Design a protein around this ligand. Structure first.
Ligand code: HCY
Length: 120
């Protein structure tokens, strides 16, 4: 079980590291093909290809992230992240709470993201 936990954590490290690297090949491999992605604040729901498309656009805006905390609670993990994006020369700063559902290799089958824009 500790191995299970340790593997999930390592994968979330890979996720966020790949995000800062801009390596979407690595992101694609961590997500189940039938996974659903939820924007909690807008109630919008996306499939994997739609989610990755949005990631691509954000990476084009210099999206960078830093993980602040990881809490393991099917494995459910809550990650708090600070993120920045540069949009038409104006940087925007965000605090995001990402709650993942991993299902067994372990794959992400669901993410709910609460996104708050903090102001630069
Ligand atoms: C561009 C985005 C969605 C659209 C929006 O109005 C603001 C942002 C900035 C933060 C981004 C977010 C999504 O892309 C999901 C991201 C990457 C998040 C930072 C971490 C995030 O929740 C994830 O890493 C999810 O796996």
């Amino acid at each position: 079980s500790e191995e299970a936990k340790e593997a999930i954590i390592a994968m979330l490290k890979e996720w966020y590291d790949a995000m800062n690297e801009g390596d979407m090949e690595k992101l694609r491999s961590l997500v189940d093909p039938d996974a659903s992605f939820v924007d909690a604040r807008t109630n919008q729901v996306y499939d994997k290809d739609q989610f990755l498309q949005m990631i691509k656009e954000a990476l084009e805006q210099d999206l960078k992230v830093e993980v602040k905390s990881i809490d393991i609670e099917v494995v459910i993990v809550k990650v708090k992240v600070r993120a920045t994006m540069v949009r038409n020369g104006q940087e925007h700063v965000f605090e995001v709470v990402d709650t993942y559902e991993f299902r067994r290799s372990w794959k992400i089958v669901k993410l709910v993201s609460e996104i708050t824009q903090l102001g630069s």
